[PDB]
Each structure stands twice: as structure tokens, then as C-alpha cells.
Structure 1
Amino acid sequence: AEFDRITNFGDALSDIGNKHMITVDMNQATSGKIGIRADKPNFDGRFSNGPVWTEYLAGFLAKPAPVRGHGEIDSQVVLKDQAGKQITYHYHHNALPGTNWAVGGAMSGLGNFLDIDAANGFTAKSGLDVLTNTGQQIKLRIANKGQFTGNELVSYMSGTNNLWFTLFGDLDQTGNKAAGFALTDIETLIDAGAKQVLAANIPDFVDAPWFAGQQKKTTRFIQSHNQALKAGLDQLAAAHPDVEIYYFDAFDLFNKVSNEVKTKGKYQDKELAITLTNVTGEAYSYATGKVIAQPNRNLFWDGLHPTTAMHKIMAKEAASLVISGRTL
């Protein structure tokens, strides 16, 4: 056989609950002073209305379902109430053994990042930067579990948040610069013994509701990133002939589904029991909580994250890429 288990790295497209549960635990530990990410109506801490693509993937390949994992978390969380009284917490959680190390918000590269808010009248000064970037996930997986054995498929899907925090934060990355961080991370996997790598590019988010009024900037970033990533993976595959690399072209899949819905009115897959009829709107509004009656007719759940229907479509394409043995 080629592999017994799947290991996942990346962001909210892959995460089965780390960003959610870390904030649940920090909220408990501070008696409600930290806001919960991926609350209801999101499904069990997924940034979706049901399972994400890494869950369908394990089903399709008949491998064990993802197990949420992370390393030790430790931080001095400093908050202030509206009166400006400072409150300090020692937040700690032991490592969590698992196989899916993805965390919503994560960027390609190393280190930790800030994507958690204080709540109920408090404001965070310091120490909420407890979430790990994709390259940091890999570093902590290696420390916790050692090098890969070769019996795993390792999925890597990152870069969306390198775009996100360039548009809406102080990150100042080109698509090619962000792609370089991804390739550095993927090379770390290889040097850690990974022999089967499922590397995904950035989806075609041209129509994502949260990117409205940024279409030229997102096309530039996502096009730049994906062609740099492809070329880099072609080079890595060249230099590492004992590694099988599958390039999940999530971009083209999003593009194809979208154009099918726009030009024929639907994208339907009878094998998956899915019919999409909307690829331009959110099924669910973050701001108001409201959800349309039939969210699984949409590509987009909120303004960026796919619905569980679209995650199923993504995993079928990835599973069939792996089954097809069409490696780089």
C-alpha cells in the first residue's frame, strides 16, 4: 500500500477545530473575556456548515478521519477592562496528540500570529498571539512526533491568509513572496521524511464576498502565488525523486465550478449528491448571524470559506488526484 494515515497542515480550509477550541478554552479560562471563533452557526468549530475537505478526503481514501492536534500553548495574556484596569492571565494547554495540525488564520511561514479578540468589554494588550502559522505547525508536529515514516500522506494547503493579512493587515507580501514561504515549509516536510505530499494552491477566490472591491489585487496575488508555487514544486519534485508530490489545483477547480454555474446555471455531481447554483454570495452572514434556507446550493458559506458541499467537491478532486497517481 502507499499510506495508512493522513497528516494535515494549513488554515481554516483544513482546520477541524483548533482555532475554535483554543478560543473556547481561553474563554473558559478567563470566565468569558475572550471571544469565541467559529461559534454557531458554524459546524463544530469548522469554518463551514459541516465537515471540511480534509474530513471528506479521509473518507474517500478510506483512511482514518483527522484527529485535531497541536503543541503546548503557553502565554501571558494581558487584557484591560473599559476602566483600564489591567488583568493578567497565565494561559496554558498541554500538547494535543493528533494528525490535523491546521489552524484557522494561519499563514505560510514560521512563528505565531494574532487572530483572537477580547470580549465583553475587555481589550487585549498582549499575549493573544497563541495561534501557529503553517510552518510552525510543522515544526511542532515534528517536535511532538518526530520525523515522518513514509507511511503518511501529508496535505499542505496554505497561502490564503498571506493574502488576507496583506489586504486587511500589516503583512506586506507579494504572491511570489508568500509562495516562497510555502515552498520553504514544504521543503521542511521533505527534509522531515515526508514521502507523499498533497500540496494545494490557493483557490480562485475572485468572487469571494469578503474580497469585494479588491478583485485586481487578489487576482495579482493569487496568480503570482500559484505559478510560483507550481514552479517551486516542480523543482522540489525534480530534486527529490523518492518523494511523490501531487499538486491539488484548487484554483482551477474553483474556476471550473464557478464558470459552470455562471454559464449553465448549476454545477451538479450526482455521485456526491450536490447541486450548486450560487457562486457569488454568502449563505451565512457573520455580522447578523442569518443563514439562507439552503446553504448547500452555494460555493461560499460566509464571505470566504466554502460550504461543506464545496469542501466535498474539493476532496473528491484531491482524492482522485491521489488515486490517479498523477504526480509531479
Structure 2
Amino acid sequence: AEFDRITNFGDSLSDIGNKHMITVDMNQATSGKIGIRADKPNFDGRFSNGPVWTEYLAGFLAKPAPVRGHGEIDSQVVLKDQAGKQITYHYHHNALPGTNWAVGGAMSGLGNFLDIDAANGFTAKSGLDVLTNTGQQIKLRIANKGQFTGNELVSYMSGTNNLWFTLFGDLDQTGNKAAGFALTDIETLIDAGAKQVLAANIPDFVDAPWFAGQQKKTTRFIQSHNQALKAGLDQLAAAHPDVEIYYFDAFDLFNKVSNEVKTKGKYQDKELAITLTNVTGEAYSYATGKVIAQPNRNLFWDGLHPTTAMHKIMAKEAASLVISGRTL
């Protein structure tokens, strides 16, 4: 074995419950005043109806299952009631040892980000920016657990939120700007000792329901991001021959799966016991509360995140690359 354990960094595609559990614990600490993310009918705090690809990945590589990790959280939560009066809670959570540092909402780059809402009629003034961008996760893992020793496979899957908050937030990043942030982060991993890196591009989200009417902007972003990331990783691989870099082309996998459903009616993998027959609709609608009968016939769980079947598909592809030594 070249590695005996896996470390994960990224966003809702990878998170096994950080976003969920930090909003549960902040809601308890504020006595009901924080909205819970990834609530039922999402599965056990994942942004899906089952395990996500980082969980299947560890099974397919026969390594230990991911365990959630994060750093110490310490914030002054300042809320405002109806009448404009401020109320405050000092929120703390100790650092949580683990291996999967991903968090829903995270963008490539450093720093914390804001993507938690007040609840129960309160508005939030400050103190909810407790979640960590992908590069911040890396920084915190090194602070908490030291440098990498070479016995880890490190997965890095980020960039979707750099697009998301460009569309629906306050950002204006180009794809190749966002890619540069990912390349900086991945260079931090190498400078910190990582010797095996599984780096993913952004999936082909052309048909994601939440991106309807954003297609020109999404398409240009994703194509520019993924071309920049690939070229940048080729360059890092040439400069660091002691590092195995695996390029998980999530884009092409989503594209291939979707073109098989569009042209042939189905994408089937009998080794995995999966058949997808829908790549354009939500299995779960956040308007009716509708969850269709057989959600694992769909690529999309909600308007963006994949079903657990599509997560399994992703994991098999990524594992395949590692098993076959298919490096840059």
C-alpha cells in the first residue's frame, strides 16, 4: 500500500455532516434560533439521500471510513429580534479530530464564509461566519494534526461554490480565477508533505435544476475553471515527481452518464446495481416536499447535489484511477 488512510477537503459533494452538525449545535446553543442545514429528508446530515462519494471511496479502496473533522469554533453570535433588540450568545465548539474536513458551502481559497441563517424570526447581525473554505480547512488540518506524512491519500474537490456564490451571492469570480484558488490550495497540500492527491474538477452541472436560466454563465465558468485546473495540475505534477496526482474528471463522468441517459434512455452499471433514467429533474423538491418513488433513478437528488447512486458512480471512477495508478 502506498497509503493507509484518506483525508478529504471540499464542499457538500464531500461533506459527511459538518454543515449539518454545526447548525444543529448552534441551534441548541441559541435555544432555537439557527436554521438547520441538511435536515430530513436528507440522509444523516449529508446533502444527498445516502452516503456521499468520499464514503464509497474508502470502501472501494479498502481504507478506513471518513470521520468528520473541523477546528475549534469560537464566535459571538449576535442576533436581532423583531423589535430590533440585540441578543447575543457566545458559541464554542472544541476542535473535532477527524479526516473529512469538507463542509457544505465551502469555496476554493482561504478564510471563513457565511452560509448559516437565523431562525424563529430573528435576524443575524454577526457571528455566523463560522464555516471554513476549502483552503481554510487545509490550514486548520495542518494546525491541528500537523503536516502530512506521505501515508495519506488526500482528496480535494472544490470550486462549485465559487460558481454558486458568483451567481447567487456577492461574488464575481471567473472560472480560471476560481481555479487558481484551487491550485493554490493543492500546492499547499504538496508543500505540507502530501504525496498522493486525488484532485477533482467541477462536475458537468449544465442540467442542474438550480442552475436553470444560468446556462451560459455556468458553462463558461465550468469550462474555464476545469481547463485551468487541469493545466495547473499538469504543471504541478511535472514539478513534483514524488507526488502522485490523480485527476478525477468529474465533469466528463457526469457528461458521459448524462449523454447515455439522453441518447439511450439509461445509464446502467450492473456491478454497482445502478440504473439512472433521469438527469434533468430533482428527486426531492424543496417546494412540495415531494420525494419521488425511486430517487436512485436520478442523477440529481435536489437542484444540484447528486443522489447516493450518482455518488457511488463518482466513487467508482475516482477509485479506478487510484487502483490503476493513472496519474498526471
The bucket for the TM-score relative to the shorter chain is: over 0.9
Partner of 2:180: 180
- Distance in 1, matches of 2:75 and 2:33, equals 15
Partner of 1:214: 214
Q: Are 2:162 and 1:152 aligned?
A: no
Give, in angstroms, the shift of residue 51 of structure 1.
0.2
- Distance in 2, matches of 1:290 and 1:47, equals 16
Give, in angstroms, the shift of residue 289 of structure 1.
2.1
Q: Are 2:50 and 1:50 aligned?
A: yes
Partner of 2:243: 243
Give, in angstroms, the shift of residue 286 of structure 1.
1.7
Measured against aligned partners, the alpha-carbon deviations of 1:191-249 in whole angstroms (never above 9, x if no partner) come to 00000000000000000000000101000000000000000000000110100000000
- Distance in 2, matches of 1:15 and 1:245, equals 22
Q: Please give the secondary structure, in 2, of the residue aligned with 1:312.
A: helix
Partner of 1:290: 290
Q: Please give the secondary structure, in 1, of the residue aligned with 2:96.
A: coil
Q: Please give the secondary structure, in 2, of the residue aligned with 1:282.
A: coil
- Distance in 1, matches of 2:267 and 2:170, equals 37
- Distance in 2, matches of 1:45 and 1:313, equals 20
- Distance in 2, matches of 1:182 and 1:56, equals 23
- Distance in 2, matches of 1:148 and 1:185, equals 14
Measured against aligned partners, the alpha-carbon deviations of 1:15-47 in whole angstroms (never above 9, x if no partner) come to 000000000000000111000000000000000
Give, in angstroms, the shift of residue 307 of structure 1.
0.2
Over the residues paired in the alignment, what is the CA RMSD in angstroms? 0.5
- Distance in 2, matches of 1:21 and 1:182, equals 26
Give, in angstroms, the shift of residue 171 of structure 1.
1.2
Q: Are 2:164 and 1:164 aligned?
A: yes
Partner of 1:94: 94
Q: Please give the secondary structure, in 2, of the residue aligned with 1:115.
A: coil
Measured against aligned partners, the alpha-carbon deviations of 1:253-287 in whole angstroms (never above 9, x if no partner) come to 00000000000000010000100000000000123
Q: Please give the secondary structure, in 2, of the residue aligned with 1:285.
A: coil
Q: Please give the secondary structure, in 2, of the residue aligned with 1:247.
A: strand
Partner of 1:305: 305
Partner of 1:105: 105
- Distance in 2, matches of 1:244 and 1:195, equals 6
- Distance in 2, matches of 1:302 and 1:296, equals 12
Give, in angstroms, the shift of residue 300 of structure 1.
0.1
Give, in angstroms, the shift of residue 165 of structure 1.
0.1
Give, in angstroms, the shift of residue 81 of structure 1.
1.2
Equivalent residue pairs, number:
328
Q: TM-score, normalised by structure 2?
A: 0.99
Measured against aligned partners, the alpha-carbon deviations of 1:148-176 in whole angstroms (never above 9, x if no partner) come to 01000000000000000000011110000
- Distance in 2, matches of 1:285 and 1:95, equals 34
- Distance in 2, matches of 1:42 and 1:285, equals 11
Identity level (%): 100
Measured against aligned partners, the alpha-carbon deviations of 1:121-169 in whole angstroms (never above 9, x if no partner) come to 0010111000000000000000000000100000000000000000001
Unpaired segments ≥5 residues, structure 1: none
Q: Which moved more, 1:110-119 or 1:79-88?
A: 79-88
Partner of 1:71: 71
Give, in angstroms, the shift of residue 89 of structure 1.
0.9
Q: TM-score, normalised by structure 1?
A: 0.99
Give, in angstroms, the shift of residue 84 of structure 1.
1.4
- Distance in 1, matches of 2:289 and 2:86, equals 32
Q: Please give the secondary structure, in 1, of the residue aligned with 2:76.
A: strand
Q: Please give the secondary structure, in 2, of the residue aligned with 1:19.
A: helix
- Distance in 1, matches of 2:191 and 2:153, equals 15
- Distance in 1, matches of 2:83 and 2:304, equals 36
Aligned structure 1 segments of 4 or more residues deviating by more than 6 angstroms: none
- Distance in 1, matches of 2:34 and 2:326, equals 45
- Distance in 2, matches of 1:201 and 1:289, equals 31
- Distance in 2, matches of 1:15 and 1:283, equals 20
Give, in angstroms, the shift of residue 82 of structure 1.
1.3
Q: Please give the secondary structure, in 1, of the residue aligned with 2:281.
A: strand
Q: Which moved more, 1:75-84 or 1:190-199?
A: 75-84
Q: Please give the secondary structure, in 2, of the residue aligned with 1:68.
A: coil
Give, in angstroms, the shift of residue 83 of structure 1.
1.7
Give, in angstroms, the shift of residue 119 of structure 1.
0.3
Give, in angstroms, the shift of residue 288 of structure 1.
3.1
- Distance in 2, matches of 1:108 and 1:288, equals 33
Partner of 1:234: 234
- Distance in 2, matches of 1:196 and 1:288, equals 44
- Distance in 1, matches of 2:209 and 2:246, equals 29
- Distance in 2, matches of 1:31 and 1:294, equals 37
- Distance in 2, matches of 1:194 and 1:82, equals 50
Partner of 1:116: 116
